[PDB]
Design an enzyme around this catalytic site. Structure first.
Site, PDB file in Angstrom:
ATOM      1  N   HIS A   1      -8.067   0.868  -6.574  1.00  0.00           N
ATOM      2  CA  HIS A   1      -7.298   0.125  -5.610  1.00  0.00           C
ATOM      3  C   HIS A   1      -5.847   0.509  -5.730  1.00  0.00           C
ATOM      4  O   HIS A   1      -5.327   0.677  -6.841  1.00  0.00           O
ATOM      5  CB  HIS A   1      -7.528  -1.381  -5.787  1.00  0.00           C
ATOM      6  CG  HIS A   1      -8.984  -1.750  -5.786  1.00  0.00           C
ATOM      7  ND1 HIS A   1      -9.714  -1.910  -4.625  1.00  0.00           N
ATOM      8  CD2 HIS A   1      -9.858  -1.933  -6.801  1.00  0.00           C
ATOM      9  CE1 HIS A   1     -10.971  -2.183  -4.924  1.00  0.00           C
ATOM     10  NE2 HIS A   1     -11.084  -2.214  -6.238  1.00  0.00           N
TER      11      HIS A   1
ATOM     12  N   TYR B   1       0.857  -1.203   0.000  1.00  0.00           N
ATOM     13  CA  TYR B   1       0.000   0.000   0.000  1.00  0.00           C
ATOM     14  C   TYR B   1       0.891   1.250   0.000  1.00  0.00           C
ATOM     15  O   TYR B   1       2.097   1.135  -0.196  1.00  0.00           O
ATOM     16  CB  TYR B   1      -1.003  -0.046   1.166  1.00  0.00           C
ATOM     17  CG  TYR B   1      -1.770  -1.359   1.217  1.00  0.00           C
ATOM     18  CD1 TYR B   1      -1.262  -2.465   1.919  1.00  0.00           C
ATOM     19  CD2 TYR B   1      -2.982  -1.515   0.526  1.00  0.00           C
ATOM     20  CE1 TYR B   1      -1.946  -3.674   1.954  1.00  0.00           C
ATOM     21  CE2 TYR B   1      -3.671  -2.728   0.553  1.00  0.00           C
ATOM     22  CZ  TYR B   1      -3.148  -3.809   1.272  1.00  0.00           C
ATOM     23  OH  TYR B   1      -3.830  -5.019   1.315  1.00  0.00           O
TER      24      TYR B   1
HETATM   25  O1  LIG Z   1      -4.967  -5.287   4.746  1.00  0.00           O
HETATM   26  C1  LIG Z   1      -4.608  -4.131   4.818  1.00  0.00           C
HETATM   27  C2  LIG Z   1      -3.328  -3.913   5.575  1.00  0.00           C
HETATM   28  C3  LIG Z   1      -2.872  -2.632   5.936  1.00  0.00           C
HETATM   29  C4  LIG Z   1      -1.680  -2.519   6.654  1.00  0.00           C
HETATM   30  C5  LIG Z   1      -0.963  -3.673   7.012  1.00  0.00           C
HETATM   31  C6  LIG Z   1      -1.423  -4.949   6.669  1.00  0.00           C
HETATM   32  C7  LIG Z   1      -2.607  -5.061   5.945  1.00  0.00           C
HETATM   33  C8  LIG Z   1      -5.481  -3.079   4.171  1.00  0.00           C
HETATM   34  C9  LIG Z   1      -5.761  -1.826   4.746  1.00  0.00           C
HETATM   35  C10 LIG Z   1      -6.596  -0.916   4.078  1.00  0.00           C
HETATM   36  C11 LIG Z   1      -7.169  -1.270   2.847  1.00  0.00           C
HETATM   37  C12 LIG Z   1      -6.903  -2.530   2.282  1.00  0.00           C
HETATM   38  C13 LIG Z   1      -7.464  -2.935   0.946  1.00  0.00           C
HETATM   39  C14 LIG Z   1      -7.478  -2.007  -0.028  1.00  0.00           C
HETATM   40  C15 LIG Z   1      -7.578  -2.291  -1.506  1.00  0.00           C
HETATM   41  O2  LIG Z   1      -8.826  -1.711  -1.883  1.00  0.00           O
HETATM   42  C16 LIG Z   1      -6.477  -1.548  -2.248  1.00  0.00           C
HETATM   43  O3  LIG Z   1      -5.498  -2.153  -2.768  1.00  0.00           O
HETATM   44  O4  LIG Z   1      -6.597  -0.302  -2.309  1.00  0.00           O
HETATM   45  C17 LIG Z   1      -7.578  -3.801  -1.769  1.00  0.00           C
HETATM   46  C18 LIG Z   1      -8.492  -4.478  -0.750  1.00  0.00           C
HETATM   47  O5  LIG Z   1      -8.625  -5.860  -1.088  1.00  0.00           O
HETATM   48  C19 LIG Z   1      -7.938  -4.335   0.671  1.00  0.00           C
HETATM   49  O6  LIG Z   1      -8.952  -4.614   1.624  1.00  0.00           O
HETATM   50  C20 LIG Z   1      -6.056  -3.406   2.943  1.00  0.00           C
END
Ligand SMILES: O=C(c1ccccc1)c1cccc(C2=C[C@@](O)(C(=O)O)C[C@@H](O)[C@@H]2O)c1
Ligand SMILES: O=C(c1ccccc1)c1cccc(C2=C[C@@](O)(C(=O)O)C[C@@H](O)[C@@H]2O)c1
Ligand SMILES: O=C(c1ccccc1)c1cccc(C2=C[C@@](O)(C(=O)O)C[C@@H](O)[C@@H]2O)c1
Ligand SMILES: O=C(c1ccccc1)c1cccc(C2=C[C@@](O)(C(=O)O)C[C@@H](O)[C@@H]2O)c1
Ligand SMILES: O=C(c1ccccc1)c1cccc(C2=C[C@@](O)(C(=O)O)C[C@@H](O)[C@@H]2O)c1
Ligand SMILES: O=C(c1ccccc1)c1cccc(C2=C[C@@](O)(C(=O)O)C[C@@H](O)[C@@H]2O)c1
Ligand SMILES: O=C(c1ccccc1)c1cccc(C2=C[C@@](O)(C(=O)O)C[C@@H](O)[C@@H]2O)c1
Ligand SMILES: O=C(c1ccccc1)c1cccc(C2=C[C@@](O)(C(=O)O)C[C@@H](O)[C@@H]2O)c1
Ligand SMILES: O=C(c1ccccc1)c1cccc(C2=C[C@@](O)(C(=O)O)C[C@@H](O)[C@@H]2O)c1
Ligand SMILES: O=C(c1ccccc1)c1cccc(C2=C[C@@](O)(C(=O)O)C[C@@H](O)[C@@H]2O)c1
Ligand SMILES: O=C(c1ccccc1)c1cccc(C2=C[C@@](O)(C(=O)O)C[C@@H](O)[C@@H]2O)c1
Ligand SMILES: O=C(c1ccccc1)c1cccc(C2=C[C@@](O)(C(=O)O)C[C@@H](O)[C@@H]2O)c1
Lengths: 141, 141, 141, 141, 141, 141, 141, 141, 141, 141, 141, 141
Positions: H99, H22
């Site tokens: 995303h 991210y």
């Molecule tokens: O899973 C985490 C995470 C954050 C920090 C450390 C470990 C995991 C996370 C957080 C916010 C949004 C998202 C997500 C956001 C997405 O929409 C994306 O890639 O923007 C894809 C979607 O499948 C996921 O739920 C994931």
């Protein structure tokens, strides 16, 4: 008050050769851990292991005739054996399914289990300690 | 250390209905046993319930920040929520998923969980005690 | 006796956008229609709508405690929420599932319902009148 | 001012057998109960039953030919017959699918209907009253 | 008492396949064989065949009403008809499903059956004799 | 030099509704067009229609016996009836599955045929003329 | 009026190995056959074969540009190529899909066509005569 | 010219853990970055985030009422929420789903989105920039 | 920096058909629009199109030697080609998948892509501006 | 002369646990019972049981060698052993598959059998008499 | 005797990336090794590579006219081409499928092969030497 | 070097029946062949067979402890046993999977292997000689 702890295929080889994924404790060390927790809790643990499904069935049969609780790691046979499940369906004392590793985070086939739907409950992924936590459940019946 | 015990939707209604599947212990009575047991384990349990997702995720955000472990019984959300899985993904301290009932012995939909894959382990079908058996595990990681 | 009419996400927007599918009546006029019909049947209809799951579970909780009937249209949550389904599982009085569009005429995901199997009955696609027919079933038990 | 009520295979035998599933009413008792409620609404109700698909398609053509609404409980054929669906897709006036029992809480094959995607609407599991409720919907259309 | 042997679509044509599958005996031969054998067990066999489902329901309804056992070879209906099964489920004496061929060595669609779950038993692949064996079963009620 | 043209359910109502999918020709017109075309190819066509499976069964049984070829448009029984397929499977003479609409371009359920795998060949989507193109094939053979 | 008749991969090699299944006729002979036949229908057929998907799409582009109809036997590409479907989707004149053999009575994978939902109609299992029947359809439009 | 940038669960925590997949950017840095481009392109950007389905639904309601367009990164709810989708369907100006991660390169379940089929378009795996690339799209309608 | 823009089968036809789906821009005009934007962003864009898989591979091999980025619209081959997938997996520089249409609002089969799980990222449904959005991302690596 | 009766896992404990299914006869008593019936048919039964897969395999080998027919109830191995099926496929005399319970009326997994496709026939659900009806079929064929 | 070794797409890039499971030899050296062993085996080996499906099918044609045998590593087209599969089905001589890497330990989609069911046998995972061991089989006929 | 050649169930019956889907050679002769071949390679082959899962596991155990390679033809166990695969995952020398027949040209269930994903490579359908090709590969390491 007797508890049977039965381990199926390949669990004689715990600590041996590889993993990492199961711990470095050996089958003998685990047998000894189980007996020590057993005594603390005021129970007799009878711990056994075989690579033979037939032998496993005999073992469950005697638990059923003795009205005795069972902590079972069928290993591989968990996801494959109806013969073993059919034997466990005869236990009238509790049945605890145990997996050393977190089977829900591995190959998808490790997610099916003939045992879960008929067990009293299941413990997965808590290390060798899973056995000991099961014993303690049995200690409260 | 501290340990957060988080209960999902509906679990506030504990032991008023179907004592046979979910126990006769009320939610307060549970806060009691977990707190006491954590004391005996030499840990401090923080035991909270919510009918709301945002709330749940928020509490899990905090544990992440505090690098504290979580015992999670997410109720029905166990089966439906990626939001909750993703919040639990941040945690660097152990996560232990709990279910009072044996979910593998019930509706099929209850046998899929988003958490099992990223949890340290999973305790299912051992009732209320499952929370306490999660504690004892944590007492030595 | 009291009859709860519970409307889930978006149903407050009832009236603006795409009649034909979900007819030209606003939410306010629907409340009016319902209470009216209930009165002529002998019932008192409390009618409520919310975009919040926690909110909807709470109202079911209240109905559950009070042992009153429920007519439910959970919108989106029909197809996705297990938490909500379980909360309805508490109810000891009848629960009528209601949808204004014929969900069997539309996308594939709308044909799955978590409420259908625990509902007494299901009324689908007969417009806003679907509610009034549910009331009538309840008036005769 | 004519509405048609068509029951398919086996509904001749309205128990006869079973209880909370299907009636305690008999077919004759239902025919007359429908006509009462119909008369009450200012509607002549034409109620007919057959174990022959061929015969049911023929009733459907006549309704199609006269632009009269249809209330249909096709019994087993609901889940199986494309021919019965095709016949009904010809109706220009409303088609209401009624099932006495709650089909969504029974065997998996009962949960499919070739009729539902082309019906105006669908009433399920409200017992025999489900025919009467379909009558007053048509009373308003 | 009396046993009903019931034969569905295309069973009239017995004797125009030859070979494996169904054998070279004909339906007339069949009724004679079944009748001799049955009175030799001290039962009377009423053997009937029809290409029409409505005709077949009728004859089931009769057995239901008279509480006689039915030995049933549904032909292609076995795999397709919720109607037939629902009729058969009404039967209070034994019901034995019979297939001349080994439906399990053939096309996949032939592997499935609406009758099996609700029958007392199923004989398959044993040819003509299969009917005769089902009579013998019925000889011990 | 006889050719049998058999038309399964609902095909007696061709002509009025959906002329852009089935043509605006009635069944009585289709009969004349076929006869007039078989005439000119020096064959004799026998064109029959029925909404009854049992009736169609019979007509197929008859061609089986006379060793005469079949062009069949089983309408809705195409996707459902094994009984129908099994009767056709008895034909020694060629069998041609005909469909006026392009079934492959339509509902999912319309894409499976119990007849295609046992048929000589299959014509779909060429209107009423698909019937006459099948006559031409059988003339050349 | 020009008709295009395109043959996909391996069809260059007709005649050698089989029939049934494919022809005992060679591609050369088939070209002549079509040509003679179209001529006594008032059509000029242009007939081409190629193992190259590039080559084949270029031909489809040509007929889209000329607004000419296309008879297509695409070989293995029939079950695999989106690129071929999409080229054909651009065609404003009819498209008839032709298979020499009955694709419905061989390997499962041959039962799926990317082309059928976008053809006018399909002709299968009538051998080489499938080509001439298609031209006849085109002669009538 | 107002453009709404709406972020879903957990997205408030951008930049603090797994910065590889991210943003390395925080939510504040991201609000800054977007308003800079919004200004630069001649727009106003309103950037809100929330862990609550209900709060989010509320904002989509507002944009819908104001015929303002929306950029949505629904995170976790992307895969699970029919509610959310139904609210978005109501929008009259463009919907672009964003995303940050490449969802097609990760767990299977991340490859289903309820939003995609109703969106104008979708940007995935292009990092934080994807929001900005979505803005430029809207600046050209 | 050189940026390669590669368009796959049928792309030579953009802007003659389905102008709502794929747009009214010709491929020539698309080249000139891409190049133009390339200059604005300070890069050279080499844009090529082929109906031929081989030619497409040869180009991708070349971008890999040269270690240059790729913006790929593979058209049909996106859902079918493992060859193409395996050629793109050699790219050491970024790879963006672009489709003009919104592939998730169309046929079921246009949802599968061998590219996406190996692409740096993916832009879908944003019309021709999509290639240009991919260009801008590349202008930051 | 010699017919072999083989029983798989767990069937040594017959008569003992769920009499309503399985029956009230022990294994010892089944042996006596089957030897008796075999003698009246002029046959000689050898009746053998064993929880061991290899042991059961050894026995199948012996009858293959001896061209003896086999009546086989494998218990759990029924649904799981390719090894057992492969052994059984070597047989040249008839193989008859027997199950005391109606296997189609219980858990789904009991509805698949590796033995059925290669068996001569299958009797299921006809209690302990199934062995005897299987004997008589063998005495006649 | 002659033996044909046919490499499909991307295989001209052997030895570039990576280690496994391709692994190190260039295609140049690969040709050199094969001809070497072949001579040693006293065979004549022609080693050809192409990225063109059409080119591939040409060589297969030649081999079939010659009655020469084929070692084939089709690359991507193993998983996708029915055309390639169909051309190989005319080989009268043996056809050995070779994969350098282990297809089974990789992505799901690598596990299907249109080739396997029609090949003499299949060698997988044994690196570059697999070609070498396939020569040897052919050496022994 | 020691190489263990392990044969699973029924392979003792090799060459006695169904020649040659498997057998021309017997199991004794095969041991002769494997040994001569092995010696000529400067290798020592230990060749062993069992119909017992446990007895096969034990020999796999002995190879892991001795870091000796294994050539395994597991018979029916190939498709069903997780115990066997898990035992083979300990092995540190190469593991090669061998089947006499082309498993991919037979019943669908034989196309699945618990062994393939973890094997160094697989040889299928090359008859007995596949063992000899597996020896040769090992001799290369
Ligand atoms: O899973 C985490 C995470 C954050 C920090 C450390 C470990 C995991 C996370 C957080 C916010 C949004 C998202 C997500 C956001 C997405 O929409 C994306 O890639 O923007 C894809 C979607 O499948 C996921 O739920 C994931
Ligand atoms: O896979 C091995 C192995 C261990 C060490 C070295 C090499 C392989 C192995 C051995 C015994 C039991 C088990 C197994 C044990 C489990 O029951 C468990 O997690 O406790 C999960 C079950 O699915 C698996 O078969 C695996
Ligand atoms: O469905 C009910 C209910 C409660 C009382 C009376 C009737 C129904 C309910 C309530 C809270 C949590 C839970 C649940 C709790 C579980 O996590 C569990 O077994 O602990 C399993 C999970 O699938 C379920 O949603 C269920
Ligand atoms: O999707 C919309 C919408 C509103 C305006 C314009 C376009 C779409 C919407 C809103 C409220 C409830 C519902 C819904 C309500 C239903 O339960 C119903 O038929 O009442 C069926 C259910 O599948 C759907 O989610 C839909
Ligand atoms: O199972 C019986 C039966 C009851 C008493 C005596 C004999 C048979 C039966 C009869 C008519 C309709 C129906 C049926 C009726 C339904 O259409 C319904 O709920 O009305 C649901 C449908 O799935 C089922 O086939 C069942
Ligand atoms: O297919 C024919 C046929 C008849 C005479 C000559 C040639 C073919 C046919 C006829 C009656 C019943 C049956 C059938 C009979 C079965 O019930 C059976 O095995 O008895 C299994 C079932 O799948 C099939 O419909 C087939
Ligand atoms: O569904 C109707 C209908 C007709 C008019 C108006 C509305 C619906 C109908 C009628 C006769 C045959 C058929 C049918 C005809 C076909 O056999 C055919 O295209 O010939 C395809 C088959 O799947 C379907 O059952 C359909
Ligand atoms: O597979 C062969 C072959 C020919 C001779 C001997 C052995 C195999 C082959 C050749 C040309 C076309 C076709 C094909 C042609 C068909 O389009 C057809 O029936 O016209 C059906 C299609 O599935 C298949 O790929 C197959
Ligand atoms: O089918 C046509 C067509 C072209 C011109 C005029 C009319 C239709 C066509 C052409 C190129 C690419 C594509 C395609 C384009 C896509 O890559 C896209 O949306 O850009 C999606 C992909 O699934 C499809 O094959 C379609
Ligand atoms: O599951 C039990 C059991 C019985 C009583 C109490 C508890 C469990 C069990 C025991 C022996 C054989 C069999 C079995 C025997 C059958 O082969 C049969 O019906 O003969 C059907 C088969 O699927 C099942 O494995 C089951
Ligand atoms: O995918 C690449 C690649 C090369 C460099 C960098 C990244 C990927 C590649 C190249 C040639 C053949 C093959 C392939 C050949 C195989 O048949 C094989 O194992 O020999 C397995 C097959 O599934 C794959 O398509 C793959
Ligand atoms: O089915 C028999 C048989 C034996 C003797 C006579 C007739 C049939 C049999 C025996 C040994 C191994 C195998 C088998 C051997 C294979 O492992 C193989 O081909 O090597 C393929 C595998 O799927 C099957 O279990 C089959």
């Amino acid at each position: 008050l007797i508890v049977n702890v039965i381990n199926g295929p390949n669990l004689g080889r715990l600590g041996r050769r590889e993993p990492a994924v199961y711990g470095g404790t050996t089958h003998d060390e685990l047998v000894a851990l189980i007996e020590r927790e057993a005594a603390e809790l005021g129970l007799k643990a009878v711990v056994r292991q075989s690579d033979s499904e037939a032998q496993l069935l005999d073992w469950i049969h005697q638990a059923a005739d003795a009205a005795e609780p069972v902590i079972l790691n069928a290993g591989g046979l968990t996801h494959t054996s109806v013969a073993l499940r059919d034997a466990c369906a005869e236990l009238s004392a509790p049945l605890i399914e145990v997996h050393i590793s977190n089977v829900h985070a591995r190959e998808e086939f490790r997610r099916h289990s003939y045992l879960s739907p008929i067990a009293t409950g299941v413990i997965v992924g808590l290390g060798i300690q899973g056995y000991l936590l099961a014993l303690r459940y049995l200690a409260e019946h």
